[model samples]
Structure formats: C-alpha cells, structure tokens
Target: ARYYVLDLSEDFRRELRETLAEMVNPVEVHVFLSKSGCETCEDTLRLMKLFEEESPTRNGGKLLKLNVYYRESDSDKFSEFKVERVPTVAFLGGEVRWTGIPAGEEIRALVEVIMRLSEDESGLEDATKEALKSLKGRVHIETIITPSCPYCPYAVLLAHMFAYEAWKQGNPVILSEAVEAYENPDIADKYGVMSVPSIAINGYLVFVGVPYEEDFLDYVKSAAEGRLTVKG
Candidate 1:
C-alpha cells in the first residue's frame, strides 16, 4: 500500500481508539495510499495504524494497505474499483468495507451502515417517491427588522421581492415583517439580532443586512429540500 502523512491530535487519537475498541465486531479497513510523491507517507502510515489499533475488535477483520505509487501493477484493479482518490478506506461487514477517510461521527455512521447491511433485509417500493412528496410544500419567510437602521428598508424590500417571486412561481411564501426594535429589544437580542433588517427564511437567518436574490433563493431551496431546519 502507498503511504502518506496524517497529523492528528493526541487526545483525538486516544478518544477514537477507545471508540473503536468498544465495537462488537471487527471491521475490515483498507487504506489506499497517495501517489503524489509526497514525503508525508510516514504520517499516513501512523494514522492507519492508529485507526486499526482502535478498531472495535482485532479479530473482526484484517487491515488492507495499498500504496498507489508501488501498486502500478494493480492499476487495473484500482480502475475497476473506481478508486479515484487516495487515502480511501472501505469498510466491510461492520468494518471498513470501502476506501476513504471517515472522521469522528462519520465513522460511527459508516459502522451503522455496515451493521445494517450485514443483517438480511428487503427493499421497499416507492420509498424515494414517498420521501420526495413529503418534502414538497409551501414554505414561509419571515423577517424582523428595526426601522432605525438604514439597511432595514433594503432587507424588507428583499423579503417582499422573494415572497412575490415565490408566489408567482406557484409556491406560496409568506413574508411577515415584525418591528422588533420598538416592540421588543430583549427578544431581538435573544435572537442575536444586533443589526437592522435581519431576515429569516422559513424561520432561519438568510441575511442580516443586504441580501442578494440568489442567496435568498438558495436558502429557500435548501429549506424546502429539508437540508436546513428553520424555526421561530
């Protein structure tokens, strides 16, 4: 296997090691070393060793190391596996079945996937269609502003434009304007609104001052796709 350098803090290493040790089964991990002619191969090796040592159980699986530089003979194998990136680790069966670096919670997430896959399962029909339908709907945009600031008017105008455009596109977007500066300074401060013309799209901040139309649309789309959570 090719090697590269990976620097990690001592504390993080220890914590990761402990987490891996507690796994119920061993995880097969494969690390594809870099071929960029870099000298950091030693660091990469250290990182791989640390990961293997911390893996849940030593008997669960074996760690496979592959160096891209020396593995020219295996070029066809790499291509067949679609290995475009180096330092890729694949985890198999509650273990690293694939390639790539998975850090912190990502490792845990991968482990969960591996565990789930190990269990016999059946696929459900219309899962994707049902999920997509669950996300389609009208979304609301609310903006709270202080009249004293010069930027407040621009924010308010932008909010109105967004609402109008969305409505025209057949998507209902309600833009509610709340004068927080006069009605409640404490609530404004609580929401971290130190400036005027604070804008919230579907209850999350889209802009604090002047908001561009593109950004406003992007935030709205993200909210609609369920990637962002907006709450008042």
Candidate 2:
C-alpha cells in the first residue's frame, strides 16, 4: 500500500482523534475500484485509513472496518449494492454511495459523515428524523460538488448523514451519491449542472444549493410519492 502525503495539521489530527473516540456504533466503508479508470479510488482507500489511524476504531470495536472490492472480482457486491458504475465508494452496504473521488475540502465532509454515522444518535432534527421514517420508495441523491466549495461540504454531509439515519431506523431506501464534479463530468452533465452543490433526488434536480432540513425532506418525500417533476 502506498502511503499518502497528507499535511494535516496537528490540531486537525487531534480533532479527528477526538471525533473518532465518539464512535457509538459500528460502521464500515465498501470501496469499489477497478484496475483501470479508478486510480483515485485507491487514494480514497488510503485516506480512509489515514482517518482511522488518527481516530477511534470503527464502531468503537477492535478494528477499523474498511473493505475493498474490485469491480471485476467483486461483481457480486457491485450487483448487491445496485452499483451502477465503477470507482464507487459505499458505506454500510452501499446504502450511501460516492461515484467520484473525494479530495480537497470534500474530504472534511466525508470524514464528518463517517464520524456522524458512527454515533448511536444522529444530529438530525427530531421532526426531520420522524418524517424520514415515512419514506418507502428508493431515493438516490446525487450532489455534484467541487472540492473547494465551503458550502458543498454541508450539502454532501447532509445527504450522507440522511442515508445513515434512515438505515439506523431500518429503512435503507436512500442512496447518497456524492459526486466530486471535477472527477466526473458525465455526472455533472447528466444533471446539467452549472454550479457546485447541485442536488438531484431520484433524478429530479430538486435543489441547487444547501436545503433546509424540512425542505430537503419534503423534496425527498415528494419524489418518493412520485409527485416531484423536473421542469428543466
């Protein structure tokens, strides 16, 4: 394994260590990469371990739970998670997915999402959490983002954490697809995105920026009920 060059500050590393010690639940990431076309996925795997090294073990258990799956060798896992493409990273059975390489400020959100998922309780609003329980249909969120957008991290974290909470409640119906726009043009163009933090719910470009909790939930519910329609 090639060691990554991360100049993370002492404070940042210490903060991450503090965050890891808070693991209230067991969590792991499923990384899917191929020998071709996803070299960045290998870097992501290294980054995951970098965080694990500076923090508490996954789930507060004995080991950090990071699993690797090769696209050709792990086709079964690809099908199991309904993985649609290569170079994907899925957490907790791919219920939350990432189709682009996470770098830049996006790394902050990725780590935040993982630490939040490790918690026994989510920081989601009580009403919002309750509202999520009513969702039945599958909801896939693809948030196209650039690594430097400060706001993009919030957008990404929200989607990832939403899926995390839904699964905690036994509803693994949401797939959070965090797309690093710079790494995936097809994804950005598929949604006709012109800016960072563009969010599409079930193929509908519902919001173009960070959405309020209730508003975001309402959009998901609307999409789930087959009531959301895209105008352009």
Candidate 3:
C-alpha cells in the first residue's frame, strides 16, 4: 500500500527545464539508501528521478544523473561517500549532501542548489564569497528542523547556499548538513534541541532561530576559526 503520492506535473517540469536553461555543467545526484531501516528512501528516489527528468544534461544527456548505492549491498561505495544513514543525496562538484527526503520547502532549496552548481554560480554576496575565500580550515554546519517549520527552511537553504559558495571557492572549507528532526531525533537530541529551527556549527550549538546572512557567515567563519559560541 502506498501512503504517499509523488507527482511531477507537466507545468512543474516545464518550469524546471526553463529555470535550468542556463545550466551548462552536468550535475550528478548520488543517492545512498539502506536495504532496510529506511522508510523514505522510496519517495526520495522518486523525487530524484523527477529531478533527473526535468534537468536535461548539458550536452543532451540526463540533466540530473543518479548514482545509487545500498549500505548493505554496496558498503564499499557507501563508505566511500561517508554516508552515515539512508536516503542520503550527494550533489556533484562537492560533498553537498541531504540526509532525508527533499520535500516541502526543502525541495526548493535542493533545486536552487542544483541550478547554482550547474551554472557555476555561487549565488553568494561578494563579502560572503570573500570570506569563504579566506577560510583556512574545515567547518560543518548541522541545521535541525522539522518539515512543517516555516522558519527552518530559511536556515536550511542559507546553510546549503553558503556551502555551495565555499565549495566553489576551494576545498571543503565548509559543509552543510540539514537534518529533518522528525526523522532523526537522536541527532537533534545530542544538542538538546527543542526548537523548530536550530543550527550547530562543528558540533557546537550556534543559533536557535533563523540568522541573517552576515551573522550566519560570521558564525561559519567563527566556527572555522574555533571561536563560535551560542548567542544569548
């Protein structure tokens, strides 16, 4: 019995294709699924397939190519990507990853990332780009949220965009992890997170609400410099 309906309406597809018109580089969407213990992998795969159908490759191939690996059947491949859970989606040209099904508001964020990466555009302000250019160490951002939280999408999207900017700059100076709290409470529990939108940088709780762009970058920079602190 199917409890969910995944649809790729013609209008949506047409808009996606138009929006992706400027895409010149082929972006691969890698998926990691566990043979068991994953309830949303099926839907997530369907969503990825939808993205593939809408994004025609730069040279007429599939725009969004899918590479699937099973944690149980293909442990080597899964370990190679360092995928820690099921329903993980890794975007190309960098380690941009999604740990759950990209749905609701998060879906927009995912599409924006694909488009940005394809056009080789960071979509970041000059200052943010400059700040990312000066980063010297690795930084990880984990933003915990529930799908229903309107505010959560803001933090999630901002975090991912920053990662894309930094990745376009150089190596993995910054990485964003957007975790859906409804699916992974243990992760949220680690930080004693009780809010809808909470962000942690390098495992340190940083913000409990949506942060402005400058402050967010400051936190990311601070995290890289080992100076991030929870705001009061």
Candidate 4:
C-alpha cells in the first residue's frame, strides 16, 4: 500500500542526481515521524526516498542514507535528539534539524545543508569560525520560517552553518532547527513569531530577519555563555 504520493519526472531525477553528485561523502538523514496525528510525516518520508534514490554511489556506498524513526518505538531518540514534535528531519544526530516539511524555498536551504554536510565544511567565514570557538555551552537556534518566504532560507542556512561548523569540530555545542511555522504554530507562538525568518537563540527571540554573520555570532556567543536574557 502507498502511504503517500509525489510525482517526479525522470528529467527532474536526473537533474537532482547531477547535483547530488557533488557530495564527497555519505550523509545520514534521520526522519522522525508519528503515525498518530502528524499530517506531513508520510510526505516527508517520500521526499527522502527520492533523495536516497537519486544520490550518487561511490565505492559501493550511497551518498544519502535515510534513517526512519517513530515516536513510540524511538522514544529514546525523541529525547536524545531534543525533538518535541513530530515530522522532524535531523542530521548528524540532531545537531541540525528541520522541524517540519522543508518545502518551497526552504528546500533550497535543506539541500545546501546536506551538501555542506557531505563535504564536512560549514562554508562560514573565517571570522565566524573563530567566533564559534568561544562557545562554552550549548547554543540552540530556532529559525522560524514559512515555505513561501524568499529570505527564510538565509536565516535557516546561517544557523545551520554555525551548527555544522561546531559539529565538524566534534564539539556538538550548537544545535539548529529550521521550524516551518505553518506546521508548527505552537513553536511560532512560543517566541511570539509574527513574521518569517524570525530567529530565536536559547529560547529568546533574537532577530527578526536574516542576521549578519557578526550579529548572529554575537547572539550565539551570548547565549552559550549564559549572558543573554530571555524575553519572555
């Protein structure tokens, strides 16, 4: 039986395969789903399959690996990954995650992050990389976004970049989540999110749009050092 349906032409698959050919290493993608009430879980799972099928294989190993988890069976993972909701897609064991369907413009950010992960580089500036070294504790960044927002990808990618850099260092001090507000209204409400690309650091609303690297790094440093105040 089919759980979901998504149409993809061979031309599209070939194009995607061409893009995924740039991956230098295999990337493990974790999808957390709940069969109880989640609406988009099946859809997201189907999308991941497309990526897995289209990815290039080198040395008899595929470029993209998909790991599926369920709320009830993977209860331990839910806590370990810090996932509070269903239909989440995590990478690097949750150092970076997309909290809902990464569709529309947000898909660009998702693909970029995957490519960056495959290369094991954040592609951040030297200054930003230096700033990440000062982090003392965990820095949780939630970039609230909408599917149609053109600038939302910038916010999500920037936050993921920081988390990716930290992850590459084997530090695991930074965690980033790209939250699709339409599917996660409660999360948006938590930060009083009134617009797309709103950023929250350590549970405190920090920026309203795509933040400059320096400004975002400053907030991440403050949050990690316990110097930032919670607005709520």
Candidate 5:
C-alpha cells in the first residue's frame, strides 16, 4: 500500500480525532480507484487514511477500516458497489458514496457520514423516518458539488442521512452519491448545472440549492412511487 501525505495541520488532525471520538461502532470505508483517468485517487486515498488513523480502535483493531480496490483488478467489487466512475469512495457497503475526491468543504459532509454510520443513526425526524419506510423503489440521489463550495456539505450530508436512516431500518431503498463537479463536469452538464450544489433525484434535476428537508423527503417519496416530475 502506498501512503500519501495529507496536506493538513496538526490542529486539523486533532479536531478530526475529537470529532471521531463520538463514534460508537466501526465504519468500513471502501475506496475504488483506477491506475489512469483518475484525477484525485491519490488525494482521496490520503484523505481516507487520515480518517483511519484518527479513528478510535476497538480490541486492538481500527474502528475505521479502509479497503482499497483498483478498477481493473477489482472489477467485481466495482460492480458490487455500483461504481459508475473512477475514484469512488464508499461507506457502509456503498449505501453512501462520495463519487469523487471529497476535498475542501466536502470533507465536512463525509465525516458526518462516518459518524452517522458509526452510530447507525441518521438524526432525521421521526416523521421523516416514518415517511422513508414507505419507499418501495430504489431512489438514487446524486448531489453535484464542488470541493470549495461551503454549502455543498450540508446538502450532501442530508442526502446521506436519508439513505442511512432507510438502510438502518432494513429498507435500503436509497443510494446517495456526492459527485465532485470539478472532476466530473460531464455529470454536472447532464443536469444543466449552472451552480455548485445541484441535486438530481433518479435522473431528474431537482434542486439547485440546499433543499428544505420536507421538500427533499417529498421528492424522495415521489421518486419511490414514480411520481417525481421536473418542475419549474
């Protein structure tokens, strides 16, 4: 395994360690990479290592386990994780995926996902949780983002939480991917994205900004029933 230096400060590391202290269970981090055509594989690997190193240990084993997969060699895993592109980082069996390098503000949302998975709690409202249970079809949420955009993290975290909550309840009806827009401009353009934090449900471009929680839930519910339609 090759190690890369994380361009982070001691204070940042300390803060991460502190934030991770809230973890109550282990988190499995799976990273998929390719030898070529990957823009941020090295940096993504480095960032994932920082989390593994900072996470608390259990019974002499790391609580945050990092697994690396190369696309050519691990084609099976690539398909298993439903990875559509290179440099994909998946958490908890790919239920929540960071489809691109989660640098800058995007890291904030990834860490929140780690914590959420560790505790198996989404922190969503009881009403929201009840609504999620009714989902009968697969809901794929792709939140297009930029690394530098501060608002992107909140949107990413919310989508992950929805997936996490449903997965914890044995529904597993949702898949959330935070796509880094800069590295994958093609994906951004697919949705007519003119901004940093646009969201798409299934394949329909839904919101251009941080969506209200209720609206997001309604969209997901509509998506489950095949009732979601593009709106102006």
Candidate 6:
C-alpha cells in the first residue's frame, strides 16, 4: 500500500494522469467522499477534472466518485465494494487495489503496482510466485521489549536462543526486538510500565515480569499466526 498528500496543483494532476496512463489495464479509480464538511473532496474533484482535461491518453480509465454518506440511501450502488473509510482511493482491476494518503512515495508505489497489474493479466500469478520464492524457508519472530528494564534482558536472551535453536535445526528464524518504551508513548501508558522490563510477542504484551519458557513459546506461536487474544 502507498500514501500521498492530495494537492490540486496542475503539475501534480498531470503527473498523476501520466502515471495512470502507464497502467497495464483499465484502472478504475474510486475516490471516496467523506461526510465531514471538509474541502478535501472539492480539491480532489478539481484535481480529477484537471487530470481528465490534461491527459488525452488516459485510455478509458477515469476517476469515479462515491459518497460514503449516501451509502445508506444508495446501498445498491456501492454494495459490491466494501467501503471502510471516507476519502479513500481504490484501484480496481481483477482485484481491489487500495492505499491511503499522507505519503507521496507510498501512493506512487501503489500507482505503479496498479499500472503493472493492469498491463499484465498474469501479474497476480507472478506476485504469488515471487512471494512463495522469498518465503521458501524463512521464519520471522519479533520480540518487543524496552531497554534498561531488568527482565527485558532475559526476554531478549530467550528470543536469541529460540532463533539459535531454529537456525541449528536448519529452519532458521529471524529474531527482532522492538523497543516501544522509546517509540510509543501510548503503549507505555497502557502497559502501565513504571520501569523498563516489559516483554511482548509481535505487538502483544505477553510477559510483564519474567516469563516461563513454555508460556513464552506459546505466546510466540500465537503471535506468529495473529491468533493471540488479549483480554483487557
């Protein structure tokens, strides 16, 4: 997924049209209008007009507008598409391609992907093949911890040992540590960590103090499959 800052400049519009014209197939661009009385929707519409007027080689691909607010009244119009949030942009071909805003690079990447996918009908197959090839024999495990915490060192060591064991067994696992204490303030507040030693599997806080080996292993497995359920 990619992101971009929406601007109604002529240069930006021309660039976007050129990017769209390079697509492999007809790209269905959906612009979701939010109910919030913001000028974003107006600016987006204006940019779309500019894109259409400026780019003559856009094929039949054009920008489509859908008001999320009217979903309730005109449910049939958008029932086929799952509308998650307003001001969302989606590229549709064989499958739904989507991304959010805020970062220009991300949006450009997504546009490139859409263009490639549109041009090549076998693009999805190729992508699957590449993904399978890359994940032939790799396991990734992330351990979240905080520095300066007494019990965190133990958790970190355990993560390393697990990775070492997996590596010795020929099936290697990559162990990575995420220090949330310094990166995320919300997590720090929610975990109520007055000191540093909180340990988490993936993004879930599994062990607050020192954790037993069996518990840590179980949590790691659960986290790997995104099956860890937390009762707050």
In order of appearance, the predictions have TM-scores of 0.36, 0.86, 0.88, 0.91, 0.93, 0.41
- Cα distance off (Å), candidate 6, residue 72: 5.1
Clashing pairs in 4: none
lDDT of 4 by residue, 200-226 (tens): 988888889898877788888888887
Model 5 misplaced regions, further than 4 Å:
1-6, 229-232
Residue 92 shift from truth in candidate 2, angstroms: 1.7
Question: lDDT per prediction?
Answer: 0.43, 0.75, 0.77, 0.85, 0.85, 0.43
The best candidate in terms of TM-score: 5
Full ranking by lDDT: 5, 4, 3, 2, 1, 6
Q: Which ten residues in a row have the lowest lDDT in candidate 3?
A: 1-10
Model 2, global lDDT = 0.75
Candidate 5 per-residue lDDT, tens place, 1-232, comes to 1112245677888999899988998989999999887868878888888889999877998888899999899999998888868688888668888888888888789888888888878989998899887678999999999888879999999998998888888888899999887777888999999986999988878888998777788888888777854432
Once fitted onto the true fold, the runs of candidate 3 whose alpha carbons sit more than 4 angstroms away are 1-11, 57-59, 229-232
Candidate 3: Cα lDDT at 47: 79
Q: Quote the lDDT for 100 in model 3.
A: 73
User: Model 3 compared with the native: what TM-score?
Assistant: 0.88
Instruction: Give the runs in model 6 whose Cα sits over 4 Å from its true position.
Output: 1-5, 35-39, 47-73, 93-103, 121-127, 130-232
RMSD of 3: 2.6
* Backbone atom clashes (below 3 Å) for every candidate: 30, 0, 2, 0, 0, 8
| Candidate 4 to truth, TM | 0.91
Give the Cα-based TM-score of candidate 6 against the true structure.
Answer: 0.41
Stretches of candidate 2 off by over 4 Å are: 1-15, 57-63, 229-232
lDDT of 1 by residue, 1-232 (tens): 2211234678866776565444443334444455555233344456667665554444555322222322355566455444444444442211122223333223343333323223311111234223323335444444555423555545544444444333333443333333334333554565577675675555555557766655555565676665663321
The count of residue-pair clashes in candidate 6 stands at 8
Ranking by TM-score: 5, 4, 3, 2, 6, 1
lDDT of 3 by residue, 82-138 (tens): 778778877753357777776666766778778777778877788988888778788
Q: List the residue pairs that clash in candidate 3.
A: 55-63, 57-63
Worst 10 residues of 2 by lDDT: 1-10
